[PDB]
Design a protein around this ligand. Structure first.
Ligand SMILES: Nc1ncnc2c1ncn2[C@@H]1O[C@H](C[C@H](CC[C@@H]([NH3+])C(=O)O)[NH2+]CCCO)[C@@H](O)[C@H]1O
Ligand SMILES: [Zn+2]
Ligand SMILES: [Zn+2]
Ligand SMILES: [Zn+2]
Length: 243
């Protein structure tokens, strides 16, 4: 039939917003109605189980000697409060929104245009040793978990955001992604964040190469929709020249 501009429709009860992730009561109410994802413990930093030469004034921009090595500045930075290279410490996350996708579950989208190499969010979670990781892999498999939330931090430490983390846990995989992980040193401690790799326009889903699953043994259908989607996610090996 002929289509027309719909009338204005205000909702019957009040809608769910990103601040409601810091309001357990309202999140749990919204979640019951399918307007928010399942509850998890929102954390501000991971749970465990260098002075630049910039002249005091963009403060600590692209030429900052700390930034170039993926090291954040300290409070002692020559630019003090105005230092732009304390993004993890100041939780200077991008304007993001959580979305419900047709096939992948929940996801994240950009609420403003994000330039290339913009910090999106820290990937926070429980930092697991190999023993605990192996125990949880078996636990989650037996429980038939639909989604996975592991990310390697270093060779002996894996971050698990299944139970505790932030909205970065909702990031989906794409075969042609628009974000990547970067591992930054913040007061001597390695942390991992998502950063854009191109200009991401407002309203676009934020995606990454989910290496943990991509190079794992088992596979699943990939719903990324990208022009050159590899078809499935998992069961892949990195390039090697054998024998
Ligand atoms: N292209 C794709 N095709 C099929 N399935 C996909 C998918 N991209 C994501 N998935 C599903 O999401 C899981 C990953 C979760 C997000 C989970 C989120 N969607 C949710 O609903 O909670 N983030 C991991 C953060 C780093 O550890 C993943 O394992 C797969 O199940
Ligand atoms: Zn600097
Ligand atoms: Zn600085
Ligand atoms: Zn794909």
């Amino acid at each position: 039939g002929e289509t027309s501009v719909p009338p204005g429709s205000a909702l019957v009860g009040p809608s769910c917003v990103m601040d409601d992730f810091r309001d357990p009561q309202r999140w749990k109410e919204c979640a019951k109605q399918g307007k928010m994802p399942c509850y998890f413990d929102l954390i501000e930093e991971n749970v465990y189980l260098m002075q630049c030469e910039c002249t005091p004034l963009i403060a600590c921009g692209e030429d900052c000697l700390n930034r170039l090595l993926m090291i954040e500045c300290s409070s002692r930075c020559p630019n003090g409060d105005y230092c732009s290279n304390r993004r993890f410490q100041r939780k200077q996350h991008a304007d993001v929104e959580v979305i419900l996708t047709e096939k992948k579950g929940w996801g994240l989208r950009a609420a403003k245009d994000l330039p290339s190499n913009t910090f999106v969010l820290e990937y926070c979670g429980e930092v697991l040793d190999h023993k605990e990781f192996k125990a949880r892999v078996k636990e989650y498999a037996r429980n038939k978990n639909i989604h996975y939330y592991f990310m390697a931090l270093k060779n002996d430490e894996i971050i698990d955001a299944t139970q505790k983390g932030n909205c970065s846990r909702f990031m989906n995989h794409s075969c042609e992604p628009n974000c990547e992980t970067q591992k930054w040193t913040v007061n001597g401690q390695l942390r991992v964040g998502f950063f854009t790799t191109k200009l991401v326009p407002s309203g676009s889903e934020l995606t990454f190469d989910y290496q943990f699953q991509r190079y794992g043994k088992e596979a699943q259908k990939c719903f990324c929709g990208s022009a050159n989607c590899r078809g499935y996610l998992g069961g892949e090996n990195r390039v090697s020249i054998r024998a």
